[PDB]
Design an enzyme around this catalytic site. Structure first.
Site, PDB file in Angstrom:
ATOM      1  CE1 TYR A  17      -4.141  -2.056   0.615  1.00 60.52           C
ATOM      2  CE2 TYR A  17      -2.579  -3.386   1.854  1.00 60.52           C
ATOM      3  CZ  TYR A  17      -3.781  -3.243   1.229  1.00 60.52           C
ATOM      4  OH  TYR A  17      -4.726  -4.267   1.240  1.00 60.52           O
ATOM      5  CG  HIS A  22      -7.039   4.978   0.526  1.00 65.55           C
ATOM      6  ND1 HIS A  22      -7.979   5.955   0.441  1.00 65.55           N
ATOM      7  CD2 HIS A  22      -7.640   3.968   1.222  1.00 65.55           C
ATOM      8  CE1 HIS A  22      -9.053   5.623   1.135  1.00 65.55           C
ATOM      9  NE2 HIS A  22      -8.872   4.407   1.604  1.00 65.55           N
ATOM     10  CE1 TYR A  68      -3.776  -3.279   5.529  1.00 65.71           C
ATOM     11  CE2 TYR A  68      -4.753  -5.049   6.822  1.00 65.71           C
ATOM     12  CZ  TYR A  68      -3.805  -4.590   5.921  1.00 65.71           C
ATOM     13  OH  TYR A  68      -2.862  -5.412   5.416  1.00 65.71           O
ATOM     14  CG  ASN A 116     -15.101   3.213   3.639  1.00 65.47           C
ATOM     15  OD1 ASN A 116     -16.106   3.966   3.684  1.00 65.47           O
ATOM     16  ND2 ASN A 116     -14.971   2.254   2.723  1.00 65.47           N
TER      17      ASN A 116
END
Length: 194
Positions: A17, A22, A68, A116
């Site tokens: 990631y 993000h 996360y 989120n």
């Protein structure tokens, strides 16, 4: 008016990631921490990386959750709760689909817009959404179905560079943000062009 005591940079942990869109907010906090000579310490108690510096006689903390993205609130609430930090003294940096690469904006309160990470923070802070946000544009792929793959992808060089530019612009208004002078931060920042 209300000095910032906590700046959070959102992102997902681990190699797959890293450098993804993000993780824009985390990149901002990493840049900030390096510029201020602040070490980010891995502290399981806060479910993230935490740094601290002094400004105007008060401690200001830096947080990159290592949950996360969808569990980022756990980290923010741990640290803000431990130090009794009100939402109004929190700034959360995050990627913003609704602005293109090269654009940064500030916003106070409001909803999550389907982010989120933000959603979890609002939830964990006891449905308090009255924290401040540094919105770092990453562009939108142009259909809702493409959004997951997009945010979790590595942008091309041109877009990476424009994000870096918008991060520099936001660092430019650090003095204002730290003081809680959101009105001035917004005039200066929202007036810039990449």
């Amino acid at each position: 008016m209300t000095a910032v005591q906590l700046i959070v940079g959102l992102g997902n942990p681990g190699p797959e990631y890293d450098q993804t869109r993000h993780n824009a907010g985390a990149l901002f906090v990493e840049r900030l921490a390096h510029a201020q000579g602040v070490s980010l310490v891995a502290d399981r108690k806060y479910f993230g990386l935490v740094g601290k510096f002094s400004h105007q006689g008060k401690d200001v903390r830096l947080l990159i959750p290592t949950t996360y993205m969808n569990r980022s609130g756990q980290s923010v609430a741990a640290l803000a709760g431990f130090f009794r930090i009100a939402p109004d003294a929190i700034l959360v940096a995050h990627d913003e689909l609704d602005m293109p690469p090269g654009v940064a904006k500030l916003k106070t309160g409001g909803g999550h817009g389907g982010h989120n990470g933000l959603r979890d923070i609002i939830a964990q802070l006891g449905n308090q959404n009255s924290f401040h946000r540094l919105r770092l544009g990453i562009g939108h792929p142009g259909h809702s179905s493409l959004v997951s793959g997009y945010v979790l992808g590595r942008a091309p060089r041109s877009e990476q560079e424009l994000l870096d530019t918008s991060i520099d612009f936001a660092l430019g208004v650090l003095p204002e943000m730290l003081a809680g002078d959101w009105t001035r931060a917004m005039q200066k920042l929202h007036s810039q062009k990449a």
